[PDB]
Each structure stands twice: as C-alpha cells, then as structure tokens.
Amino acid sequence: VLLVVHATETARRVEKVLGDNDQHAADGCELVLVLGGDGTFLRAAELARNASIPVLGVNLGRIGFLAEAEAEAIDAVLEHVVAQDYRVEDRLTLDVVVRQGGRIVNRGWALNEVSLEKGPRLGVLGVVVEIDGRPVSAFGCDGVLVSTPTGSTAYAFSAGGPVLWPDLEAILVVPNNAHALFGRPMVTSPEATIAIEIEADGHDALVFCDGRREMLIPAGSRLEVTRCVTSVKWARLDSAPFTDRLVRKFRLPVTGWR
Amino acid sequence: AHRSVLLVVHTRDEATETARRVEKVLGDNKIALRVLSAEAVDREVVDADQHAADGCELVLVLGGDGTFLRAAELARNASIPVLGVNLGRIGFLAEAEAEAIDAVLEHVVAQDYRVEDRLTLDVVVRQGGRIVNRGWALNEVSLEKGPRLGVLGVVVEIDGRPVSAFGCDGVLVSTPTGSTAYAFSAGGPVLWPDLEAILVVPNNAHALFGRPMVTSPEATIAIEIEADGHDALVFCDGRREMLIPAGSRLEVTRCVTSVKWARLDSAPFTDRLVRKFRLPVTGWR
Amino acid sequence: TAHRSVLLVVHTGATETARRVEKVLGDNKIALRVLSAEAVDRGSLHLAPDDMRAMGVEIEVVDADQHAADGCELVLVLGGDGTFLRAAELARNASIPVLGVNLGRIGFLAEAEAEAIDAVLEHVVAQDYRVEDRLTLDVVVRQGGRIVNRGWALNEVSLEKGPRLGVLGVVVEIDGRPVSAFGCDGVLVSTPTGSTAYAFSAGGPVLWPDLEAILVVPNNAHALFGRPMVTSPEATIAIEIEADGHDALVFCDGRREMLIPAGSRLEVTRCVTSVKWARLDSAPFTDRLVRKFRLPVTGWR
Amino acid sequence: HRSVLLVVHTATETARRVEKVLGDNKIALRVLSAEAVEIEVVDADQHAADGCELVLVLGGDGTFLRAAELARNASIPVLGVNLGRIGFLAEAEAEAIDAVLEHVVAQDYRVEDRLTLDVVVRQGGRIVNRGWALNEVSLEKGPRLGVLGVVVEIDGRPVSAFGCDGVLVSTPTGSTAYAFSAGGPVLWPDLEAILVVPNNAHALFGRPMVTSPEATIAIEIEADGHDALVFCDGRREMLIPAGSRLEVTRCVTSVKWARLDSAPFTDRLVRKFRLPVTGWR
C-alpha cells in the first residue's frame, strides 16, 4: 500500500494496522490509499495510473464524490484493505492528443475533464468542435470541456452541463462560455472522437486534465479526445449510491418521497 | 404467399410522385403494396385499416419525423423494421429524401439494408403497488401537469433513491433519439443516437436544481405524483396518452423490445443536427 | 357624506384575525368593506349587524359587489400571493393601495404575517405606510386588424398553447420588428414582480420588484435562441399566433383567461395605471428571495 | 475652431472620405490608430480627444470600446461607423459614410446619455482602486486553476455565495457580449438596469439577476484565496486583493452616445445571431 494524505491524523491508525499484517514511479505497490478530498483522489489516481493498481479514498475534510468511505470508519476499511476482498472496477478514462501538421506533438489523460481553455486572459478562442469526423460548431468561447461521467459533476457542471451518473459510459462535451446560439452540452457514445480545432490565426491555448496536468496548445492545432484503452482502477465498497452523494453535495430537497 | 410492404404517407405533395414510384417498383418485383385506408380514401395493392398492419416485411414511411413515429407504432406491433423518406421538411429519423427514392427501392427489394435496434423505453404507471397502465416510447415519455394552472408536485427517483422534489409543468424522460425533440425545447442536452443512455429533463421546474440528468441504459427512473394534488398525464411520442392518477408512481425503464430501424448509407447525426439547426460550421479542417 | 373606507379581502375557510381587523377598524371609526361572496359565507363567519354594532364598528359595508365598484383608502388582503393578486384585481378599478398580511406560506408580495396584524392594523389606522407603483401590463388581442378582447396583469401574461399535443407556432415582435419565430409551449410576458413566478420556472432571470422593465421568456421554445429578453418599459411585445395552427389561450395572473384565435395577435404594453402597493418596514426583496429559494448566503460581513 | 478625433482600426476609403469632407468643411482631424494645423496623428493616450467635439470610429465593436474610452475621458459623444463586420454599437455602416459625415459637419445628431457602470475596489474602509464600464465589469479567477470564492450582495444584503470562475456585472448594452456567453439574458440598450451574471458558478442558483439602476452590487472576494482580476470593457484590467470588496453602481456621468437614424436593436440582434424570423405579419 502506497498511502497519500492531506485534523488529518487518522493517518496513523492506518500504519498501525498495516504493519500488523518519492512521487513519479512511486507505484511499485498493490494498492493506493488516499485520505483527503476529491482533489487528493485525483492526485493519487495520477500515481496509481502508471503501474495500474486500484485507488481507494477516505473522506477526511469535506464531502465529495470519489471517496468510498468516511473518516470515522477508517478501521472497517482497513479490514478490507487486509482482506484484499473489495471489487476493483475499471472506470472510463479519457485519452487526449494534440496534433500539429498531422503529427502528434503532445499527449495526456483524464478521469474527470479535459479542459481546453483560452490563452490570453482577454479575448476569445476560436474553436471548431468536431464529432466522429464531422464538424458540429464553430464559435468563440472560453474553452471546451470534454468530460467523463465522473467529471460531469466538477467543472463541466459549473460550465452548465448535465449530471451524468458515474456508471454510465459516455463522453460529455460542454462548450465553456461560447458566444453562440447553441452552446448546449452534447453527449456521446464511449466509442466516439471529439476533436477541437484551435484557430490558426489566434493565440496559443491551454489544456488542463483533472485540473492538474497542464499542456500547451499551439495555435492552429487539433485536440483529439477519445476513450482510453487503459482505465483507472477504482476500489469499491458498501459506499452510498451516487444519487445520495449528489443529494448531500448540493443539499437537494427530497421531502415527500415514498 | 408473397412479400408486402406497408406504406404510410403524410397526405398531397410531390408525395404522389414518390408514392406512385413506390407502387411502380414493388409491382415490377412482385412485392405487394399495402396502404392505410384513410390515406387511400383521398385517393398489387391491399388496403388495411390502421391497427395491426403486419404480414409485411418493412414499413416504408413517406413524410417527416412525426410521421415516422406513427409508423413505428404500427411497426412495433409485428416487430418489423421501419424506413422513412423525407418529403417536405428536414428531420432526424428518415434515412433518405424523396429525390433518392429509386435508390431506396433497390434496397427495399434486395432487402440488403442494415436493421438496428434503437433503444426504446418502457413505462409503467403504478398505483398502490399494482400496475394500472403501461406504455412505451422511442422518443420521450412526457409526464405533464393535468390542469392548466397550478404546479405538479413530483419526486424524481433514480435507481431506488430520491433525487429531487419540486413542482413543475412536468418531467421528460428521453431516449437519446428523443433528445432532439421536446426534451431539447425544455432545456436538454443533445445526445447522439447511438449512445445508449437515458435522459431526464425536468419540464419548467420552479426550483433551483432542474438540471438534465443522464443515466445509463440499465437505470430505473421513477417519478412520484403528489398524492394530494390532481391527476397528471403522460404522453408517449406525442401520441399515446395515459391518465396518471394522483398519488401514483411512474417507472421508466429500457424496453427489451427495441424498435427495429432500417438503416441506410445516410448522413451522420452530426450532419443532421447541423442542417436542422443551421449550426455555424465554417472554418473546419 | 365624508368618511374613511377600508376593503377587507380574505381567503375564506386564521380568518378571525379578520375580526381583529373588524374590532380595531371600528374603534377608529374606519369602514371595513366586504364583497358579495365575502358576506354570503365565512370570512364573514360573524356576518351580522347584531355583531357589527355590538362591536361598536359602523363596519361591514357589504354593499360592495365585486369588481368595478368602490371609493376607499386601502385594500387589506389577508391570505396569500394568490389572494393579493385577487385584491389587486379589484383595487385596479378604484386605483388604490393593497396591503397583504400572510396567513400561511411565505409569499413574495405580502408585507407581513398574521402574528403582526396588531401592528399592521396600527399602521393602517395611521395611514402611515408607503405607497409604491409596481409595473402593470396591458394586453390586447387583435384580429383582422382590430381589438377583439383585452386584459391586464400585475404578474404575467402567459400565452399558452391550446390543445395538449403538438406545439404552438409563434412570431415574437418587439417594438414593431420581429425577433424570433419558433414553435413553443407558449410565451410569458412578465413584469419584474412576476419574474419570480411561472417566468422563473420557465427559465427567466430574477428581476428586482422596483425595476421598470418587461420580461419575455419563451416557454419551451424549440429553437437555439429562446433566451429570456428584457425590454424597456415602453416597448411593445406582440406575439402573432400562427393561422394554420390552433387557437390558444392566455392567462393573466393565473386567473383572467382569454381565448386567442389562430392567426390573431397579442400586444402587451406597459399600462398607464400602475397598481399601488402599501408598503411597511418589511424585508427587502433580497431577503425574500434568499428565503423562498433557500439561497446559500454565508461567510459575509 | 472645431475638431474631431478619428479612431480607425487600420478601411482606407472611408478614412479618406472623412479626411476629405472634414477638410472641405474646416474641421480639424485627429487620427488615432486603434491597434496602438488641419490634421494630426496622435499617440495612443488617454487624453487624445481632449478638445474635440466628437469621437468618430470606423471599425467593429472592439474598436468602439477603445474610442468610447477616449470620448468618456474628454466627456464628449462617440459615433461609430461599421467597416468589415456586423456590430451592435455603430450607428451606421460604411456605405452610408457620406450621409453620416453630413451630420458630423452639421452637429445635428441627438446625443443620449447611456447607462455606464462605476466600479470601486475597497479594502478595509479605504478605496484602493477604481474603474468604469460601458459593457461589463468582469470579476475573474486569478489563477488559471481552482475556483474563486465569492459572496454577491445587493443593496448591502447578501444574495449568494458560491465558487465560480468570476462574476459579470453588466450594462444592458453589455448583455449582448461576454455576459451573453456566460448565460445571460438579452437586454434592450435603452433599458436602464444592471445585470448580474455569475460566471461558471459551481452552484444550483447561478441565475442572472437584473437590478434597478440605483442598486449597489457588491462582491466580496474570499479573504483566504488568491487575488482576482477585474476587466472592464474587455480592456482595462485591475488587480483585486484577496479579501476585498468590489462595488459596482451606476456612474454619475455617463458616456455620451451620438445617435442617428439607425436600425433598431431588434434588427441588430436578428442580424448578428441570424435569428429565424419567417412568417411575421
């Protein structure tokens, strides 16, 4: 067990029960356990990625979407860490390439969001969004989010997208502040290719993945996002349903229900 | 025994050039046309009343989107594929336009076309535990306020836990295919026709969260009609109506009986979306 | 001859705070009006002059029949938003202030709740409230060139599609020129006051009550642009209902209904005579919004 | 002596005809390039129009804004003529340059005050920066990543607190621009109101508010986050200290807008957005 953390000192009760029984290639292990927030989980996934092992997440501070257990139950988790018994479920991951003159110049991955974004703070990004080899819209905007159903709850939600339950397989596209009549979010089979075409004449742009790995989009290039061949592995427990998490998260009213 | 095709036509246009061309081709090939009596009453050729016209291999539809949907009600019955040709306006469901009629007919005859099972929804109105009506939809199930003024108390439940209680004009539960229709009007996202998912769009919900939700094809969406209020209504495909009683419960699920759609060498969904909505697409690659 | 009159309006069936009106309104030599309906049933549970003089209250001038009838100082609705809208109804004829006390649910238009009717009534007596003109709308229906029905609204004018199925085709024109043609469920021409109601539901932004503007929110427009539009107070919204389609209906303030024939034309304009709203030291519109939508507000000064 | 500042984007046929007619008529011409005695070429300077009777602009909306800046600083009218593109802000299009010039010479055009927003950055009781806007104050996330903490307040009373990319406070003229991009409703430019539009707010109520033009819109910047930016009319930047309080009110002296016999807004709107309009009347 790699253990990534951070009142965050239930950190010790983890090392207690585990011994009872440098970040980059820091994988080597069989499981990653994270004690922290949604952001921390995204961080651990980074690490679990390269030597494809499961991730598990324990919610210390706030209330998020990814962690599979509360803090005040860190023991009932350890039992399962020992027991090796949890179902590990593969989850849709996005693959992104950046291509100039037909040639792949940069490449990345996300489990929440590929967020192509304006370069200069002032002005707009000309972009042509493309779906399965055909164009759907040209407009200027702050960027385009290409999102996973897990990620459909993060930034893409802020950009105004719909909420996708986490066990669905789809790719979500939410144009981010598009100056245009149809800036409607679009949803697409997991088999599809979203390509966005940065304006040749304009300035360079950025992409961000899981709000943490940055790339540089040269003017005139092409982002291709498709479903990735090697998913992220998620530990799963007797956690609450996504539905319950959405409800808690957003204090959604639910009185009157049978 | 013989082959037969059922032809469903909008009714008068260059809808007659096309109909006659259909009567011609199948005639030449010993395939019997069959038409709907009302349609044949403003002028081999059998003539059926409109309930279950089957015995046929294909339902050929000449007209537009709303027409396709009538045709599919007819096809659902004997579960036979439907194929649509556009006459006047621009739609999402036809696989060709009249100006390519002759070519379709080569396919109608050869029967060489692909037949996809497009996702279909299954609805049950349940009261007191006991199912009191059922329906199905290929586009949308539209739960809607009964009386014109007032609001409809609703709780939306997804996979067995409640997601939201509000008042609204209604709730749409939509097929990817139906995301283009009423759901779009009500604020929904466009979903691509091949995706298998389920879309929920609260209709005119007076409340903060009325986001579209999208769900995998295996989910159950249930909507509980406020007991004390008035009876609601559900509409499937803007054609079949069920009276939802106050206090009942509506479950929508993926149907096991897909509508068979007869597929051709046609435009991608993207292109059709662009055409319909005049989407600005200059500058592309 | 010379005299002080005050119209009670109530939601019949805490309606006895209504007699607390009838008490206090008497010892002050006021009025207490009531309508036909208001005094053929409850609300006037104590309907009798055998109670209205035993109270020392030259009170109950039931005389008043509903609508185009009366010359008072104020209208005092106890009831809800529903009812304030009723009262406003009448009052608009007489062109006089409306003051609403809230029995049940929290409303946007009520100046107080019943646990206060004591103080409320004290301010009524003293005439020491504030009056304030809220924007009111005027709607006409015009067919074959000429007016063929007319209406008015304080909240919304809701043009709604007639038959249950299919869709209503509509061209929306603002100050003379067309702005969007689409099929929809309808179109809301709303007041700032009314942007809280159906218009909100239908996606409109929230407008502060004092603002002077007109809000247009296409209801479920099947179109890329069905944004809400906000227009100056003196614009003219016109919606032409398509000819080949069906008739339609409009409702003003969720009550005064009008049939809108196919091919006719709706024109909404600000009305010359605003409704007048009696106003106390009450919550600003901000706090009402924060309460009725339960808005997250914290980490502030 | 009468004088006019001409702001052209740098296109020449129009520019020449202006040079021409204002010569023939004894009006001094100051030319300023927008990228940046009978005629002068003037440096880009906030005081360029300080003596002129009018600012005339050839170009689209972005240029109008640059010109408006100057006209505001010299407290005189601006007038725009469109060149290449379609805009909301010009009063006439290049082909009608002659007619326009005639009015320029004549000084017979209506000049209407148009609502302008005044913005202040206040911190600990002192006002520590300030600005104005004719389109929008755009309060924005400082760091490219992360969200910005915000509490939005109307006449002293809080209305919402959420994380966001920023908050737009917009002028009705403005409602057509970035505000529109952000989800805003469209506002007729004669209307006098202030529009608030949250920008990518991770919350259920991100709904546009529209406020009487006497309101005080304030925004309190989370004391624990990073600095934020504010941009005005897509062009005048201001650093916003963490913990401070933005305030936007209607400015006392507004921008003067020369008017003319132009298309009504409704048309402008239909023109830009290619709004479907068939079957009318």
From Swiss-Prot, chain A:
<dbReference type="InterPro" id="IPR017437">
    <property type="entry name" value="ATP-NAD_kinase_PpnK-typ_C"/>
</dbReference>
<keyword id="KW-0521">NADP</keyword>
<feature type="binding site">
    <location>
        <begin position="112"/>
        <end position="113"/>
    </location>
    <ligand>
        <name>NAD(+)</name>
    </ligand>
</feature>
<dbReference type="GO" id="GO:0006741">
    <property type="term" value="P:NADP biosynthetic process"/>
</dbReference>
<dbReference type="GO" id="GO:0051287">
    <property type="term" value="F:NAD binding"/>
</dbReference>
<keyword id="KW-0547">Nucleotide-binding</keyword>
<dbReference type="InterPro" id="IPR002504">
    <property type="entry name" value="NADK"/>
</dbReference>
<feature type="binding site">
    <location>
        <begin position="38"/>
        <end position="39"/>
    </location>
    <ligand>
        <name>NAD(+)</name>
    </ligand>
</feature>
<dbReference type="InterPro" id="IPR016064">
    <property type="entry name" value="NAD/diacylglycerol_kinase_sf"/>
</dbReference>
<keyword id="KW-0067">ATP-binding</keyword>
<dbReference type="GO" id="GO:0019674">
    <property type="term" value="P:NAD metabolic process"/>
</dbReference>
<keyword id="KW-0808">Transferase</keyword>
<dbReference type="Pfam" id="PF20143">
    <property type="entry name" value="NAD_kinase_C"/>
</dbReference>
<feature type="binding site">
    <location>
        <position position="142"/>
    </location>
    <ligand>
        <name>NAD(+)</name>
    </ligand>
</feature>
<dbReference type="GO" id="GO:0046872">
    <property type="term" value="F:metal ion binding"/>
</dbReference>
<feature type="binding site">
    <location>
        <position position="43"/>
    </location>
    <ligand>
        <name>NAD(+)</name>
    </ligand>
</feature>
<feature type="binding site">
    <location>
        <begin position="153"/>
        <end position="158"/>
    </location>
    <ligand>
        <name>NAD(+)</name>
    </ligand>
</feature>
<comment type="function">
    <text>Involved in the regulation of the intracellular balance of NAD and NADP, and is a key enzyme in the biosynthesis of NADP. Catalyzes specifically the phosphorylation on 2'-hydroxyl of the adenosine moiety of NAD to yield NADP.</text>
</comment>
<keyword id="KW-0963">Cytoplasm</keyword>
<dbReference type="Pfam" id="PF01513">
    <property type="entry name" value="NAD_kinase"/>
</dbReference>
<protein>
    <recommendedName>
        <fullName>NAD kinase</fullName>
        <ecNumber>2.7.1.23</ecNumber>
    </recommendedName>
</protein>
<keyword id="KW-0418">Kinase</keyword>
<dbReference type="GO" id="GO:0005737">
    <property type="term" value="C:cytoplasm"/>
</dbReference>
<feature type="active site" description="Proton acceptor">
    <location>
        <position position="38"/>
    </location>
</feature>
<dbReference type="InterPro" id="IPR017438">
    <property type="entry name" value="ATP-NAD_kinase_N"/>
</dbReference>
<comment type="similarity">
    <text>Belongs to the NAD kinase family.</text>
</comment>
<keyword id="KW-0520">NAD</keyword>
<dbReference type="GO" id="GO:0003951">
    <property type="term" value="F:NAD+ kinase activity"/>
</dbReference>
<dbReference type="GO" id="GO:0005524">
    <property type="term" value="F:ATP binding"/>
</dbReference>
